[PDB]
Amino acid sequence: CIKNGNGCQPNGSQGNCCSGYCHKQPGWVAGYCRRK
Numbered sequence: 001c002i003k004n005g006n007g008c009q010p011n012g013s014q015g016n017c018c019s020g021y022c023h024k025q026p027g028w029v030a031g032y033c034r035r036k
Contacts, residue, residue, distance in 0.1 A: 001033065008033040 001018040008022040009015025009031030015022060017033035024031025 002035060004032050004034055006033045 003019075004023065006017070007030055008017045009024045010029065015024070015031060019033055019035055021034045021036070022031055023034035
């Protein structure tokens with residue numbers, strides 16, 4: 001969990017990262033976490 005290299009929003013099933021911040025662009029399938 002956490003960091004720009006971990007699953008967070010693969011298919012929008014209420015995606016949420018422990019950090020409390022994520023990142024998903026309208027292109028890639030699975031959105032990864034984000035710290036800042």
